[PDB]
Write a protein that binds this DNA or RNA. Structure first.
Ligand code: A1AG8
Ligand code: ANP
Ligand code: MG
Length: 373
RNA sequence: AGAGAGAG
């Protein structure tokens, strides 16, 4: 445990970028994981939502970069285009002063423009989503020759059944000596088993499941009775609220579109976000929510992981998540870096089992919503 | 399953 960025043997010009970004003291995960990452160990880093995992790996990557080698030295993957873009902006701002280059390799962007930029000069760090990154590797416009660090953010999503093969196909193009770093708020037992295909006696920084939920996010439930409409329950509640910014999670794209329309039909101002929209529209919606121009986003799990909007203080689970790990991530959209937030769960009878599994596994208190608001 | 995840 190192409690000061000055105590981490970081180059002075990386420190200029850290302090310019506004950080003053390292968070708990930063105090524990930056040094092992810099030293080149494989690291599994679990830590509570919103406590600074991004800068943990960005700082470690930037300290390792050989700036005058104009070649890609580090590859970071994320499960969604929005998260990859967010991560890219953090690395680029931390690395700006020292002159590290960081390029986003994500789907839905002009390929010719990207290929020309890569042809101009290989960026030091690539942050991307797996499909586009593997495409660029396969076309040979991205070279793995000097990649010595491979970071999976949201690692347990990236190593799930639907992604692990994409990750493994990219991993095949990397040198055997590549350092591997995995970070997530959740690290379930099945994923930790999978990590042996990727990693060599790694350092494990884990959180006890009964201590994972954030103290500052008050969790509540509302029972929806059999004859009641969940839509009325949300609208009645939504009226009695003064929102700064809020996220409402829905399990399907179809239902996001439907709910957005219903809410507009009751003169509520919301915007919708999901993965079947054009990337230009996704970018606009995200930008307007980050800036505070729209106050309430209705979304799928596209935005459950990693997305950081400080002003979000309210999460509503209109549908409960289909796996318990996404519960942690969804409610973690509020309460970023020690702010107090609220999460509200709508619970129909068929939802009780799901919510019960969440409560007992994480040993967390979910209380009946009071009238205080 | 859902949700994500290249190009054309
Ligand atoms: C089991 O096979 C796979 O894992 C493959 C396929 O799944 C794959 O083709 C694949 C998709 O299939 C429907 C969809 C996909 O995203 C969706 O659809 C995109 C397009 O619309 C659909 O093509 C648009 O964006 C996404 O919606 C927004 C990415 C993707 O990448 C793949 C791929 C295949 C070849 C390739 O270079 C030759 C690059 C990517 C997977 C892959 C394989 C290795 C490494 C990473 C990813
Ligand atoms: N040392 C720090 N001091 C102050 N703010 C910080 C520090 N590190 C990170 N932050 C901010 O805390 C917020 C959360 O950081 P982020 O890296 O997104 O968290 P995370 O641990 O990855 N959360 P998640 O992916 O949802 O599990 C961002 O606004 C960061 O700028
Ligand atoms: Mg994160």
């Amino acid at each position: 445990i190192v409690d000061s960025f000055d105590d981490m043997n970081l180059s002075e010009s990386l420190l200029r970028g850290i302090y310019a970004y506004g950080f003053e003291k390292p968070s708990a995960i930063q105090q524990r994981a930056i040094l092992p990452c810099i030293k080149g160990y494989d690291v599994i880093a679990q830590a509570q939502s919103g406590t600074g995992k991004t800068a943990t790996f960005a700082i470690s990557i930037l300290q390792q970069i050989e700036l005058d080698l104009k070649a890609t030295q580090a590859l970071v993957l994320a499960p969604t285009r929005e998260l990859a873009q967010q991560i890219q902006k953090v690395v680029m701002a931390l690395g700006d002063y020292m002159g590290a280059s960081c390029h986003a390799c994500i789907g839905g962007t002009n390929v010719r423009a990207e290929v020309q930029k890569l042809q101009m000069e290989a960026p030091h760090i690539i942050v991307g989503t797996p499909g586009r990154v593997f495409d660029m590797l396969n076309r040979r416009y991205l070279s793995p020759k000097y990649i010595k660090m491979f970071v999976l953010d949201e690692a347990d999503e990236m190593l799930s059944r639907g992604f692990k093969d994409q990750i493994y196909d990219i991993f095949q193009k990397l040198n055997s000596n590549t350092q591997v770093v995995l970070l997530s708020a959740t690290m379930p037992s099945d994923v930790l088993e999978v990590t042996k295909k990727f990693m060599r006696d790694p350092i494990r920084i884990l959180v006890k499941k009964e201590e994972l939920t954030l103290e500052g996010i008050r969790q509540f439930y509302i029972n929806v009775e059999r004859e009641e409409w969940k839509l009325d329950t949300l609208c009645d509640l939504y009226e009695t609220l003064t929102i700064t910014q809020a996220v409402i999670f829905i399990n399907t794209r179809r239902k996001v579109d439907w709910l957005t329309e219903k809410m507009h039909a009751r003169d509520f101002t919301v915007s919708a976000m999901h993965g079947d929209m054009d990337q230009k529209e996704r970018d606009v919606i995200m930008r307007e929510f980050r800036s505070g121009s729209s106050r309430v986003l209705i979304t799928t799990d596209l935005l459950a992981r990693g997305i950081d909007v400080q002003q979000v203080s309210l999460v509503i689970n209109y549908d409960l998540p289909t796996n318990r790990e996404n519960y942690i991530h969804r409610i973690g959209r509020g309460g970023r870096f020690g702010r107090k937030g609220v999460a509200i769960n709508m619970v129909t009878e068929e939802d009780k089992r799901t919510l019960r599994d969440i409560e007992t596994f994480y040993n967390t208190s979910i209380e009946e919503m009071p009238l205080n608001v």
